[model samples]
Every structure is written in structure tokens, then in C-alpha cells.
Target: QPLLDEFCRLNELPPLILEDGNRCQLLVDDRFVLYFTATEDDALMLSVAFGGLEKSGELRVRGLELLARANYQRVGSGNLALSLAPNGRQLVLAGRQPTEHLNSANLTVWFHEIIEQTELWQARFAMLDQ
Candidate 1:
């Protein structure tokens, strides 16, 4: 709880402890939802729900292709993994980091970066679709 408390303090948000304190779901301005869970090896996994994929067509295919290319290149560097949720019909961007490496500064940066990047990709994908 100590590290999580610090995380909330740094973000200036309320504490959100979930599922036996192994994970947390926080809301940012009632707009964005950020979920954090711990891995077996003590690594922290972070993800944000981007948007829903309602239909399948060239656009969807192109978007997934883009995500694949991005993920492959981002391997080992950003720990980025983007995927389309199977049943939810949505997309999410995720990343993982060692617990020891997570802190106030980097945490804040990454929290927003993923959201922003997702939006950016969505726009790019929209353009591609059009």
C-alpha cells in the first residue's frame, strides 16, 4: 500500500485498491480509465482502454496492421503491446515495467503518454480508413 499510496499522492488522485490489493483501477477526470496490476515477478502492468471496434473491414485490418508494426518495433524498448479486446470489441494500449523502476516521475509520464499515443493512433487510423 505504501508504494500505491505514493502513486496516488503523486497523481493527486484518490487511492484505488482492488482485488486483494494486487491491482487498482483509477479514473482520470471521469474520462480515462487506467488499470494497474502486478505480475508474478513483481513487475507492474499498466493499460488504458482506448476505444471500441464495432465493425470489421479494410479500416479494421489496416488499424490492426498498424498496431502490429508499432508493437513489433516497440518490443523490449517501450514494453508496448496493443491489442483489440476479443469480446468487448474495444482496443487497449498496455505496457509493463519492473516495480523497482516505477516511481513518481516516470509513472506520471507514462500514464499520459499511453493515452495520448492511443488517441494519436486512432486519428491516424481514421485517416487511413477514410
Candidate 2:
């Protein structure tokens, strides 16, 4: 937890200790919601839900196609691996960074990177709204 504590310290924020389920919620930049959890080897597991899909048929199909294409493209957003979940209504992003090599600089970088990824994909999903 000290790793996260250090992260909070560097950001001038209060430390967040992970509770049961080994997970804790963090709001980045006052807008994005991120979940931090611990891996078996004490790595940091970061995940966020970017957008929701329509419950109906064709819209869901279009959204799934975009998801598959983006993943297949292997774009720079690979760090923020994209996937569909929760009965296909949610688009989720996740990344894992080892605590051993984590520091204030790279940790901050990683946070913003994932945030950017979330923003980028969220917009892409929006195009399918119509």
C-alpha cells in the first residue's frame, strides 16, 4: 500500500489504502474514475469503464466491431487494453504496472496515459451513437 501512499504523496493527496477485495477507487483529474487493485506479485492493476453501449442489436454489433478493430490495430493504446464486458454493455480499459519499478514520475505518466486512452476511445464509441 505504501506504493499507492507514495503516489498520493507525490500528488499532494491523501493516501488510499486498499480494502477488502484488494481494490480501491481513485478519481483522476476530478473526472475520470479509476480502480486500483493489487496483483498476486504486488503489481498495480488499473482499470476504468470508459463508455456504455446501446442495449439493442445493431448498435451493439457496431460497437463490438469497432472494439475488435481497435484491438487488432495494436495502436499505442495497447497499454490501456480495451475490452467489452458486463453482458456487452460496457467498454473497459485495463493496464498493469509492476510496483517494484513504479515511481512518482512514471506513475503519473501512466495515470494520464490511461486517462487519455479512455478519452480517446470514448470519443470513438460516440461516433456509433447515431
Candidate 3:
């Protein structure tokens, strides 16, 4: 709920948008529609449709396990609280590192990683829709 709220708040769009057309709808109305399916080759395909015309693309989410593992690495580490923003564009993280002592270096690194991962996710989505 918080995640969904955050996503909606940040994008100023409703969740229904994600269930609609692929990238074209998202481009036109800032909405997103995602499709997941399994192919005969046993491959999982993810697609995004955006507009009224259903302009969309697809991507392979095979690497999702890696991303999930990477994300979980920091969980309960006492150094970070990582959460996805509602809009799914940003990652919100907070933590206290006794060693850092307000240096903010850890937070910076975490933020950088978050941004990198977010970009990677976006890139995958873009590729799928293309």
C-alpha cells in the first residue's frame, strides 16, 4: 500500500494505468501497462504498452532474480531500509551506520546504487516495449 501510494504520488497517475496499454499510453498519459507471459521456449517475456494505440515493447526479465538478490543483500543489515517509491522510479532508503557517524558516505553509496538499479529496470522496460 505504501509502495503503491508512493508510486501514485510520484507519477501522479493511477494504478489502473499500469494495467492498460503499453508504453504509448504511458508516454501520452504517463500510464504504464505490463504484460507477463511464458513462451514455448520456457522463457519469460515482459512487455509494456503505453498509449491509446497500445504502442508497446517487450523485455526479458530473466535477470530479475539477480536484482532481487542484490536488493535483499542490504535488508536487516542495520545500515539501510530500502523501499521502492510508489511511482517505481526511485528507491527510498534510510539507515544508520555507526561507523559512518553522519558522514553520509554510506547513504550516498546506497543512493547511487539505487539510482543505478532503477535505471537498469527502466532500461529493461524500455527494451521490452521497443
Candidate 4:
């Protein structure tokens, strides 16, 4: 909680109060919904729902394939993963790091990085619809 407070302070944003003691959501520049979860073991998980996909058909297949490819190398990065949200409609990118390794400046930078990656993936997915 204090860590998040410091992060917000450094970013010049309002503090985020965790509604459930361990979870909170932040909207970055009104462009991304970032889900932050603090685990009992003292780590923070960052996740974002990049976007949804077609209900069915070839475009959906292509979307899944793209996600799979993204996951291939990303899994080895030890920090991020791309997965299909349950109910089969949305793509979620999740990353985690121990709280001991994070601070206001880096956390803020990481948040920006997540938003950038999410936008990149969104554009790739959007091309499928075109």
C-alpha cells in the first residue's frame, strides 16, 4: 500500500486504495486498465486486458495464433505472459515482480511499458479486423 502510494506520488497521480487489501485497478491516461494484485508472498502482479476478439471464425484463429507467438518468447522473459481470458473473448497480458525489487520511479516506468506493449498488441490485433 505504501509502495503504491509512493508510486502515485512520484507520478503526480492520486493515490490508489486497494479495495480488497491486495488488489486495485488503475486507468492509465484513459487508455489502459491495469490490474494490480499483491500476493501474500510479497510480489506485485500487473495485468491488462488488451482487447477482445471475434466471437468465431478465421480472424479469431489468427488472433489466437498471434497471442501464441507472443507468448513463445515472452514466457522466457520471466516477467510477462499473454493469455486468453476465460469465456474466450479477451486477451490478457500479466507480469509480476517482487515488491522488494520495485520502487516509485521504476514502477511508474514499468506501468508505461505495459501500456506501450498493450497498445502494440492492440494494433496487431486491429489489423486482423481490417
Highest lDDT model number? 4
Candidate 3 regions with alpha-carbon error over 4 angstroms: 1-103
* Candidate 2 lDDT (Cα, 0 to 1): 0.78
Candidate 4 weakest lDDT stretch, 10 residues = 70-79
TM-score of 3: 0.27
Candidate 2 segments whose C-alpha is farther than 4 A from its true place: 29-31, 74-78
Estimate the overall C-alpha local distance difference test score of candidate 1.
0.71
Deviation from native of the Cα of residue 68 in model 3, angstroms: 8.9
TM-scores of the candidates in the order shown: 0.79, 0.85, 0.27, 0.89
Candidate number achieving the greatest TM-score relative to the actual structure:
4
The 0-to-1 C-alpha lDDT of every candidate, in the order given, reads 0.71, 0.78, 0.35, 0.80
Tens digits of per-residue lDDT, candidate 1, 20-128, equal 7677887755666788887888677888776666467776777767767877665332586778787745777788888788777787777777767767655665566
Candidate 4, residue 47: CA error in Å?
A: 0.7
lDDT of 4 by residue, 1-130 (tens): 4568888887787667787565788886687788888878788888989888888999999998888888767542227888888889988888887888888888877777777888888788888865
| Model 3 agreement with the true structure over 1-100: per-residue lDDT tens digits | 1122343354464442323332112222244433332234433222333212112222223333223554566543334333444554333333333432
Total clashing pairs for each candidate: 0, 0, 20, 0
Q: Give candidate 2's error at residue 62 in angstroms.
A: 1.3
* lDDT string, candidate 2, 46-96, tens digits: 898877887879988898788887876654332557887867688888878
Full-model lDDT, candidate 4: 0.80
